[PDB]
Amino acid sequence: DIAHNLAQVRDKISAAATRCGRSPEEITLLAVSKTKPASAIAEAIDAGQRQFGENYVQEGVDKIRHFQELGVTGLEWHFIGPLQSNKSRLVAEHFDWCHTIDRLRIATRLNDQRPAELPPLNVLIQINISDENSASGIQLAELDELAAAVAELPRLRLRGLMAIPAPESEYVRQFEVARQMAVAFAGLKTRYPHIDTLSLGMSDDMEAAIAAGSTMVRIGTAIFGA
Ligand SMILES: *Cc1c(COP(=O)(O)O)cnc(C)c1O
């Protein structure tokens, strides 16, 4: 039951924040609805969920159009999959956030294809913090340069960082890796304006990510099922 699962997940986030001294409000729950039907998103909506994350462009665009044509206001849609250049226009025209800026050229494409009447597209720069086997995300050594270039693009708004750490079973390492992201995120925050989003943490490392300083966790299966 989606309404019940949403309650259980929000309770875990709330408990995790309180234990480490943070206010639960600091943690945004991103409900990841990739591969799940619109009817399931509609249940999450009827239960108060507003921010949804999708990974595949046409799947996400169809969902966005569906809920626009029902007139459901609110809703923030986050593109959290890898973005290839020949599908960037659909993202720039329909999505509210994109977490996967990992090269300047995809950012400038998004900037250029974003209609001027929409709000700036909120973007995070994706760090490959700990994953040998991923071609996604930049190294931390590249952050300052990419952030400067991206932050000039006027139809985008650089809001912080995202990372998908390598899968890790040890809590100690979950926290250390996440802390590395939190540190980079703080250092970014001193120099840049409106840095407020660390997209970090899924079901299995949720506690360490929150304790480390994440502002947003991405939960799919624990909400929608398998
Ligand atoms: C699929 C996905 C999630 C959610 O996955 P679950 O383990 O099913 O909760 C979170 N973040 C990203 C980037 C994803 O692709």
Residue numbers in the entry: 3 to 228
Manuscript excerpt for this entry:
We serendipitously discovered that the K36A variant of YggS, affecting the lysine residue that binds PLP at the active site, is able to bind PLP covalently. This observation led us to recognize that a number of lysine residues, located at the entrance of the active site, can replace Lys36 in its PLP binding role.
